[PDB]
Curated annotation (Swiss-Prot), chain B:
Changing F734A: Strongly decreased G(q)- and G(i)-mediated G-protein-coupled receptor activity. Changing E268A: Abolished calcium-induced G-protein-coupled receptor activity. Changing T116I: Reduced calcium-induced G-protein-coupled receptor activity. Residues 580-591, 715-730 are cytoplasmic. The gene is CASR. This is Extracellular calcium-sensing receptor. The chain holds residues 20 to 874 of 1078 of the full protein. Changing T109M: In HHC1; decreased G-protein coupled receptor signaling pathway. Belongs to the G-protein coupled receptor 3 family. Glycans are attached at N71, N232, N258, N343, N389, N411, N431, N484, N537. Changing L698W: Decreased activation by positive allosteric modulators. It is linked to Hypocalciuric hypercalcemia, familial 1: A form of hypocalciuric hypercalcemia, a disorder of mineral homeostasis that is transmitted as an autosomal dominant trait with a high degree of penetrance. It is characterized biochemically by lifelong elevation of serum calcium concentrations and is associated with inappropriately low urinary calcium excretion and a normal or mildly elevated circulating parathyroid hormone level. Hypermagnesemia is typically present. Affected individuals are usually asymptomatic and the disorder is considered benign. Hyperparathyroidism, neonatal severe: A disorder characterized by severe hypercalcemia, bone demineralization, and failure to thrive usually manifesting in the first 6 months of life. If untreated, NSHPT can be a devastating neurodevelopmental disorder, which in some cases is lethal without parathyroidectomy. Changing V742I: In HHC1; decreased G-protein coupled receptor signaling pathway. Changing S118A: Abolished calcium-induced G-protein-coupled receptor activity.
Length: 801, 799
């Protein structure tokens, strides 16, 4: 037949069931020295007993209601799996026992309410699909069961895990973490979920540090290896796809070693597990964020639950062990002795200490789905069926494949006003709820508080809602933890690569002296336009600096004062000779060449005033010829009076000025000078300077000036001794000598300096030469004429010679 | 009862077997409108038929042998799986029929020769483990079957895929690639293998572009998506963990789109598959590199194979369909009519057209393992058994759990002289061979050429051997392909991050100025230490130059020659004055003062030699006073012999020197100058110069000298017209003018140059001033004393 411990009742139509009443089997590596025996189950499961009671309650309600299946009863045959494949397959062999008589007594089974674990469900479905017996599961959520090529008669009332993996990725992206590790159970439930999560997290630019597998039957060395892998890591957020039985040993080891500060993200299987939500583990598993399914209502279920008895439950064979485990007594069929009149409310167990019904509602829904398919078969009308020619099935000889067909074409409304339909893959979609683990002040137990939800019917990117103010991190903290591999670079600083490490870990390197950085996390430094240079902090770049000899400057003001003083002195000398024209010393110097020379000296100082200021196109063209013309005129006026025909004395000056003017015009027409902004000298600053355009013409001008100064020198030199005109040759020689020594002296500075000081030396040299010429030629004569010798030599000495 | 078509023979002990005689089942979309019927298998598998024949040959050889299991016979019951779970479970229910009757005319099965696919073997083992019936598989290599908490009676004669997944990464690292993609079958064989490969590749710093899943029953849309993923990638190497049936549709679609240039890494399941190794597909799948198992020898297998007959094989129910498929005719119990007189050497099929036996040898060994376990049960001695009190099992009433117990403790030698034994998880270990797909020049078919091996008994990093000169990369090329995400940086450039991409993809950025890099693939430019600056190419860094006025430089030699010439000239004027000491011209002035003046001229000239050369602290501190003191001594000597200066003469000169000396001493105690190596002015040049410490004191040492010179000027200027000592006061004013003119004219250049030329300017100024001071006074006296030996001495202003 099958297992001796069961819950069964007779009826017209029989339903099968598989529930975990125990958490596992005994650890016994049999050595095969004798014939093997049956294995034993260990730890009782009050939640599984409640789920079984939910199935029985639904069946009894259906049998009581006259509106769903009149004059037809339902039976059941329910077994225990102990979360093990081997035990489940023994019970499945009894389900198909009658059907195998024809293919290769127990009444035939129509449908089976599925298992809990995905591996157990796959093992059961492989065998149930041979005979086309429908199977409806309440807890299996693996994506591997959606393949209808291998599983032909599998349905479920629970959604699959792809949406939940995407939800975890969305949560991690919401809190702005990029450095996590993963842990998964080594079975059909954890591995596909963790693979989907990895695929989703890779496209959101999240780096995963470690990934490990665990099991209920792992050994101490494996546990310690996983613990060391966890301990050596800097990541704080850990994502776990597992259940309580598969997770308990690792949690126990971590608690013993006292590892704190971790952030756990829990899947639906262990997010509400009483094996892990223990008060003494809170310093490790406090403040967990996990997922929960949607709750439903079953009105009289609790009153039904409070009625179980070891003696009155004849059809329930698990009630005896339930009573013994609940009250820690022994039942003497005719540790203290059970008396049988105890109170269930006295002992606190997960049997009735619950707030929401989630998987129990799924069991209820699966039973009602099977009942509604049978009712749809019952109420068929001839000619309008789902079979060939519109024929209807026979309710007195209904078969499992016909029940499966009507299950595939099913649509009904539940007790809450919602529609229930199965898709082409036999899946049912639903929302998710997000919970946080708190600590109770009144009792000291774990309290699950809602903090958000995940809406599956919304557009991508608007599925997650979280109320952050209700979250206590690690159970007590109000601050969002930091889970990034490295700190973000700041303004002025740039990212660097570390060899052998993922893209999420980098080094902050400073930007160079020509580039800057505005925001955080720059992968390169930006070069800014050519008229700007980078700031010291390198946050931005400031404008460059323009440098030229300018007015409103202490140096330029002094130069201007010197120039105007020279102009005024020349004007005063001219006025002196104007006043004293008739008198004799003024006449023994050609009267009008003196005026021309003073005019040329005024032209000289004004020429110096050209160089001060910001260079422009129209000044670089005139500044240099202006000094040349005037100084050649000065030299000519001096040379015509030299010791060696009135209109002839006005011919030489015009001729020399004529050659000078002619050279400048040729040069300017063919290659005029122009302004030239200079940036190559320094990166930081810019110079505004004139560009000559032709050095040949400048050399020719300087050569002509030097040649004229030379001929004067040689001729003034040959006749210095003469005492005429107060030793005029002696002073002319001095004036020429001042010229040559000054210009030769300034050559080096022209050769070396490059900035705003090259313009200053030119003004200094011009003023020096002009003053040296004017003073030497004029001041001795102007002295006697006024001041003391009012008449001492004002006539006779001049008159005599 | 059970499946209709089978191979069956009765005996004392019955074995079970499962083989894929068909590649799959018909794609019937069942809508439930009738009582569902059995599905039908479609494509024939000659390789699977040969595998089935190997088991029968082994059993017949065992039955013929008289030294193994004497006076006992072996039977068998063999079914077909068609590579599906559902068909395999129908046969497995017949294997456990009698035991379940005992649990709750059927012969008992003690052992089953396992299936081919890992997914099928898992489902078969889940049911066979309930009754403790041992199962020995020949082809299932998933690592999930090593878990003995779930699979209590599973054994295999093939190694698992951990070493293969490691060897894939070993080969990839050997050929220096870091940009690959992965493809796996969606079952129990491909997913764990691709997971292990991903772990190892991430361990070896290898970047994976994409990862896709395929299946035999994938629709058009999934294949289109996979092809689109493949065709958008720049990766050229693809790792595949799948079989031929699950890989055929994708290969067909890629062939139709005719995508060339890819490098395929094949797992053992499809590395020798005839569904993929077709001459039409060669332009896409040419040059594939894959794995193979080690071949064995069965010394009578081919003659047994060549003897099959549809009418002489009574115990083989597959031979009729084998004959029909082979000869394309019909057997009587519009295809033509078969006879029994065809020759199987005419039609070329994988049945007898093979080179090596790899899985057939595994089947042979799987049968012989059970045979030797039974023999070990047979020859047990009382008190030396494996059971509770040392007892022995009974061969007449043997049981499957006892056979499993003896299987767990098996150790025997096979026909190749090798030892066979199963470890704690019921696994074997074995070598791998590496093959390369070539094209036959004569037949046009595909030839599998061996190019290496993988030794699993060696140490990590010494297990792979590749003979690279035997590899054709696309079937026609001898150059290793390039499969890196980005090109490698050059000598002067470093890496740079590309956001949104893995570490294997980067950009090259040039090193800045003052930094360099030298390795091939740098991630950070290096700042080489101070006193060094980068090259133009930023590849190596060179030493920068030290700039100072050097003795060996010809400018310094010329200045030294000038100084030496001045020193000598002073020596002749002193020697001449020494010769004519008491003569009238030398007696005219005070010779006691002329010697001091000539001695200070040498002191001045030598001060210039203190400027030339590499600066040091003491020379720098000694430069200025050495000239100042000597020149003030000269000036005082001249002054005290001008008109009406009034020994007191010696007093005045020394007193004036003592003032400049004290200013000098007050300077050195409070603010001495020192040497400096200047880095701020330029980048590639280092300047050695002097800071002058306190500039104010130097101001005093210049103003005092200028005032002393100026006073001498005025008083000489007053008396410029007395014809005494050959117009002495005419020449003193000239010397003062020369000194002032030289220093005034040298102002500009001193304040324009802060390089190595400033010292040259100072040297030139000192030399010019000293030469002027010499020639102003002494040249005229010498003029008429070198010649005119005594002409003017008698009455020079009346001597
Ligand atoms: C941790 O790393 C993440 C990922 O780089 C950072 O999130 C980025 O934050 C900036 C500014 O807030 C955004 O412009 C980016 O779009 C974010 N990236 C992503 C992928 O969302 C986060 O700021 C980092 N946190 C800390 C504390 O460094
Ligand atoms: C697996 O392959 C290795 C490498 O070929 C084998 O070791 C070699 O065996 C040959 C034959 O005896 C020796 O000549 C070599 O010296 C061995 N070492 C090497 C590095 O080649 C090994 O025997 C093979 N294992 C099995 C079981 O065949
Ligand atoms: C492709 O990339 C790999 C790894 O980035 C390069 O392998 C390196 O090659 C250099 C020179 O041959 C060796 O010094 C390194 O040790 C190698 N690194 C590793 C991890 O093996 C390879 O050279 C690149 N190939 C091309 C063509 O650029
Ligand atoms: C005002 C002055 N200009 C000097 C330019 C120096 C220069 C700057 C750049 C290049 C060159 C050179 F390479 F051409 F020499 C020289 C000047 C102007 C006109 C006549 C002059 C005659 C005598 C003295 C000065 C004269
Ligand atoms: C060797 C010389 N050192 C002068 C440096 C400053 C300077 C450089 C160029 C020009 C001028 C000056 F003409 F303005 F002084 C000063 C020195 C040392 C000690 C005493 C001196 C007395 C007179 C002259 C030079 C003296
Ligand atoms: N979905 C889980 C089973 C499961 C869901 N909720 C649970 C609650 C408790 C225990 C198990 C479960 C699986 O496939 O394996
Ligand atoms: N070992 C493979 C099957 C296999 C190995 N070699 C083969 C050769 C041909 C066909 C299939 C195979 C698996 O577990 O699935
Ligand atoms: C953890 O760290 C220790 C000490 O640093 C190191 O020796 C060890 O290899 C690491 N182990 C794991 C499993 O990461
Ligand atoms: C199920 O029935 C409701 C009730 O009218 C209907 O609105 C809904 O479309 C039905 N669903 C399907 C899939 O037919
Ligand atoms: C899921 O949640 C959204 C918003 O919270 C709600 O509108 C929707 O009706 C929910 N879905 C179901 C099936 O209750
Ligand atoms: C391949 O590239 C094209 C062009 O960018 C794009 O439209 C397509 O979506 C890509 N394929 C996939 C699978 O992303
Ligand atoms: C198997 O037997 C041989 C003797 O033939 C022995 O050398 C070898 O060690 C044995 N193997 C094991 C694993 O005991
Ligand atoms: Ca009813
Ligand atoms: Ca690494
Ligand atoms: Ca025999
Ligand atoms: Ca990317």
């Amino acid at each position: 037949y099958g297992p001796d411990q069961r819950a069964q009742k007779k009826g017209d139509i029989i339903l099968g069931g598989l529930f975990p009443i125990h958490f596992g089997v005994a650890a016994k590596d049999q050595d095969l020295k004798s014939r093997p025996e049956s294995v034993e189950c260990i730890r009782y499961n009050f939640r599984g007993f409640r789920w079984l009671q939910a199935m029985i309650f639904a069946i009894e309600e259906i049998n009581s209601s006259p509106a769903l299946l009149p004059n037809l009863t339902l039976g059941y045959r329910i077994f225990d799996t102990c979360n093990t494949v081997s035990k489940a397959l023994e019970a499945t062999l009894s389900f198909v026992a009658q059907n195998k008589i024809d293919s290769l007594h127990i009444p035939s089974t129509i449908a089976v309410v599925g298992a809990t674990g995905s591996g157990v469900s796959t093992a059961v479905a492989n065998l149930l699909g041979l005979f086309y017996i429908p199977q409806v599961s309440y807890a299996s959520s693996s994506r591997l069961l959606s393949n209808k090529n291998q599983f032909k008669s599998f349905l479920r009332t629970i959604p699959n895990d792809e949406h939940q993996a995407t939800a975890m990725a969305d949560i991690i992206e919401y809190f702005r973490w990029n450095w996590v590790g993963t842990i998964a159970a080594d079975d059909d439930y954890g591995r596909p979920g963790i693979e989907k999560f990895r695929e989703e997290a890779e496209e959101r630019d999240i780096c995963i540090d470690f990934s490990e597998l665990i099991s209920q039957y792992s050994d101490e060395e494996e546990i310690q290896h996983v613990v060391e892998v966890i301990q050596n890591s800097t990541a704080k957020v850990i994502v776990v796809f597992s259940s309580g039985p598969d997770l308990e040993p690792l949690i126990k080891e971590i608690v013993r070693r006292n590892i704190t500060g971790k952030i756990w993200l829990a899947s639906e299987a262990w997010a509400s597990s009483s094996l892990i939500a223990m008060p003494q583990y809170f310093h490790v598993v406090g403040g967990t964020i996990g997922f929960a399914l949607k709750a439903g209502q079953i009105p009289g279920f609790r009153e039904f639950l409070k009625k179980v008895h070891p003696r009155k439950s004849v059809h329930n064979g698990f009630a005896k062990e339930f009573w013994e485990e609940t009250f820690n007594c022994h039942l003497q069929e005719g540790r203290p002795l059970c008396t049988g009149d105890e109170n269930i409310s006295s002992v606190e167990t997960p049997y009735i200490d619950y707030t929401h019904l989630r998987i129990s509602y799924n069991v209820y829904l699966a039973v009602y789905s099977i009942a509604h398919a049978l009712q749809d078969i019952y109420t068929c009308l001839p000619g309008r069926g789902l079979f060939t020619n519109g024929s209807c099935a026979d309710i007195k000889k209904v078969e499992a494949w016909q029940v499966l067909k009507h299950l595939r074409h099913l649509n009904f409304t539940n007790n809450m006003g919602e529609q229930v339909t199965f898709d082409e893959c036999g899946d049912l979609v639903g929302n998710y709820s997000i919970i946080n683990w708190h600590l109770s002040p009144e009792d000291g137990s774990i309290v699950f508080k809602e903090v958000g939800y995940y809406n599956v019917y919304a557009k991508k990117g608007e599925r997650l809602f979280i109320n952050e103010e209700k979250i206590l991190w690690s159970g007590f903290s109000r601050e969002v933890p930091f889970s990034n591999c490295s700190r973000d670079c700041l303004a002025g600083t740039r990212k660097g690569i570390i060899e052998g490490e993922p893209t999420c870990c980098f080094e902050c390197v400073e930007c160079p002296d020509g580039e800057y950085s505005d925001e955080t996390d720059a992968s390169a430094c930006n070069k800014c336009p050519d008229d700007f240079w980078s700031n010291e902090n390198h946050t931005s770049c400031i404008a460059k600096e323009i440098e030229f000899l300018s007015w409103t400057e202490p140096f330029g003001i002094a130069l201007t004062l010197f120039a105007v003083l020279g102009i005024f002195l020349t004007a005063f000398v001219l006025g002196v000779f104007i006043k004293f024209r008739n008198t004799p010393i003024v006449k023994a110097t050609n009267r009008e060449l003196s005026y021309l020379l003073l005019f040329s000296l005024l032209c000289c100082f004004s020429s110096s005033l050209f160089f001060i200021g910001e260079p422009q196109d129209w000044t670089c063209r005139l500044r240099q010829p202006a000094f040349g013309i005037s100084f050649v005129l000065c030299i000519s006026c001096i040379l015509v009076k030299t010791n060696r025909g009135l209109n002839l004395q006005f011919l030489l000056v015009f001729l020399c000025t004529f050659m000078q003017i002619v050279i400048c015009v040729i040069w300017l027409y063919t290659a005029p000078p122009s302004s030239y902004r200079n940036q190559e000298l320094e990166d930081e600053i810019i110079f505004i300077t004139c560009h000559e355009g032709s050095l040949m013409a400048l050399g020719f001008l300087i050569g002509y000036t030097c040649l004229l100064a030379a001929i004067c020198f040689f001729f003034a030199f040959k006749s210095r001794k003469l005492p005429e005109n107060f030793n005029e040759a002696k002073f002319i020689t001095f004036s020429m000598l001042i010229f040559f020594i000054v210009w030769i002296s300034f050559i080096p500075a022209y050769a070396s300096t490059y900035g705003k000081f090259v313009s200053a030396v030119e003004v200094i040299a011009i003023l020096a030469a002009s003053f040296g010429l004017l003073a030497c030629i004029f001041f001795n004569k102007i002295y006697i004429i006024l001041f003391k010798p009012s008449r001492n030599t004002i006539e006779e000495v001049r008159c005599s010679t």
